[PDB]
Amino acid sequence: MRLGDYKALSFACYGTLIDWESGMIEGLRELTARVGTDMSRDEILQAHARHESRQQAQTPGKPYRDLLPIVYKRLAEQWGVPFSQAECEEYGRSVRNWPAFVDSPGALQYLKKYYKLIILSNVDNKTFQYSNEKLQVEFDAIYSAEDVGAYKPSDRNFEYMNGHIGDLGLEPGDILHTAESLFHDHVPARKFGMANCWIYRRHAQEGFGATMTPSHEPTYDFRFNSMADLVKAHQEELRN
Ligand code: NA
Numbered sequence: 001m002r003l004g005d006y007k008a009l010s011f012a013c014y015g016t017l018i019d020w021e022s023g024m025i026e027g028l029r030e031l032t033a034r035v036g037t038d039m040s041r042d043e044i045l046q047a048h049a050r051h052e053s054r055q056q057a058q059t060p061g062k063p064y065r066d067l068l069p070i071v072y073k074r075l076a077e078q079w080g081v082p083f084s085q086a087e088c089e090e091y092g093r094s095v096r097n098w099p100a101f102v103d104s105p106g107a108l109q110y111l112k113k114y115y116k117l118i119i120l121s122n123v124d125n126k127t128f129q130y131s132n133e134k135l136q137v138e139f140d141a142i143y144s145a146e147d148v149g150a151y152k153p154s155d156r157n158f159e160y161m162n163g164h165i166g167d168l169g170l171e172p173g174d175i176l177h178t179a180e181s182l183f184h185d186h187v188p189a190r191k192f193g194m195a196n197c198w199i200y201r202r203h204a205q206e207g208f209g210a211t212m213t214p215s216h217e218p219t220y221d222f223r224f225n226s227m228a229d230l231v232k233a234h235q236e237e238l239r240n
Contacts, residue, residue: 001221003234006195008116008140008170010161012152012179013123014098014210016199017108017227018131021045021210023098027091031072034081045209051075053183053212056122056151063124063146068092095123096130101201107227108137114234116140116168118175120161122151122184140168152184158192176222178230181211186218197222199230 014020025032025041032044039047051074055067062070069088076083111117117139121128124146132139143161150156162172178197179185189196198220202209224230 002237003176003197003222003230004114004237006115006176007174008118008165008168008176009111009197010118010120010175010177010194011108012177012181012185013119013121013128013131014095015201016178016180017100017104017135018098019101019201020095020098023095024048024210026097027094028072028075031076031079031081031083031087031091034083035079042205042207042209046207046213047075047078049208049210049212051078052210053151056145060145060150060154060156063126064122065092065095065124065127068095095127098131100131100134101227103226103228105134105136107231108135110231111234112137116170118161118165118168119143120152120157120177120185121145141165152181153188155188155191158188158194162192182218183208183212183214186220187214187216190218195221197224197230199227200225 011017025044028044032039048071051071055070069092072088072091108117117137119139119142121144123144125144128142128144141164143164145151148157148160172194175194176197177185177189177194178199180199180201186196186198200223203225224233
């Protein structure tokens, strides 16, 4: 069972290629400073994961940049600190500052040589253009939550990808779904019978950070601690 068996990789973006945990810690810094209970990073991320995934279910058609402001409000109210709508809206704009993992641009450019690259992302298209600039690769397709009308882990996102990859000359069995989030990506990927590759960005950390804690952890065909390690295993495959 080999990385080279696939014509395409489908990538989650935020948490896999973009360091959204660092990004949102920064975007929430003013808000969490108001709380002054000195919350740990992961408590902030997990609190965000809860309000984000629930609001994504509540208003699946809402652009991510308009959804995160509601998450900010919910966090502020849960934590019991004051806030303004203007801060909420600004937090939804902060995605465009969320930094790439440093191995992402180089890894994606390497992978581009060997695979069509597909994005399957919990994001709106306007926001994602900024992330794509940070990533410095051309994607063969970008299937976003805005396109879909729903957020991962909804079935609709994978259905929407499967219904469009024919335009790229692909079938679902050609695609290795590559992602960090067990909850958003690997549970549904397995439900759709996709081969999957877990980029275990949190290998040296505890718990699931900005993704919901899955009750039934999914299997995965490949696992690597980083995009760099995915590339390393690929180069090794070609050596053999
Ligand atoms: Na994403």
